Homo-oligomer: A and B are copies of this chain.
Amino acid sequence: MQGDPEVIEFLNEQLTAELTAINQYFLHAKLQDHKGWTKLAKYTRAESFDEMRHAEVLTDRILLLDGLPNYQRLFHVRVGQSVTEMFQADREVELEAIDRLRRGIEVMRAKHDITSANVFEAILADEEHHIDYLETQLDLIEKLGESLYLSTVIEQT
């Protein structure tokens, strides 16, 4: 088929965000593992792979609509140094996704591309779950302090 160019622009924009999220989450995961934050890195890594699944779902639909998936562009990768900064950086990415998905759902349904809208709806629910994890961990960091929090994730390995 051939999609609506504005719908394809939306898919490619979210695709750029996922590729950005993949790099950010993967690098944070490697930073946390290297700092010895074993249990936390394991979670961040899996979040990275989930963004890859989002990228592949978007790519599939872009191709079905006869668009060219954008694998060249990246947004600015946020790199945190402390555990608090890493969660805050990753939360910022998911907050931009939310808005980048909400607006896309309204256009896609207005232009009747319901299947593309549902791709965004599913990603939106996932991103909302992840931000909930990030904000829950940040609340934990505020209550426990960074050291006590970090103490729960390190592993003699």
**Residues of chain A at the chain B interface (Cβ within 8 Å):** 1, 19, 23-24, 26-27, 30-31, 34-36, 39-40, 42-43, 56, 59-60, 63-64, 68-69, 71-72, 74, 76-77, 79, 98, 101-103, 105-106, 112, 114-115, 118, 121, 124-125, 128-129, 131-133, 135-137, 139-140, 143-154, 156-157
Contact = CB atoms under 8 A, between A and B. Distances in A.
A108 B149 CA distance: 37
20 contacts: A1-B131, A23-B71, A27-B59, A30-B56, A30-B69, A34-B63, A34-B136, A35-B140, A43-B156, A43-B157, A72-B76, A72-B77, A74-B74, A101-B114, A102-B114, A105-B112, A140-B154, A144-B147, A147-B148, A153-B156
A139 to B, nearest CB: 7
Contacts of A42: 156
B156 A63 contact: no
B139 A36 contact: yes
B36 A136 contact: yes
Contacts of A124: 114-115
Which of A30, A101, A106, A129 neighbours the largest number of chain B CB atoms within 10 Å of its CB? A30
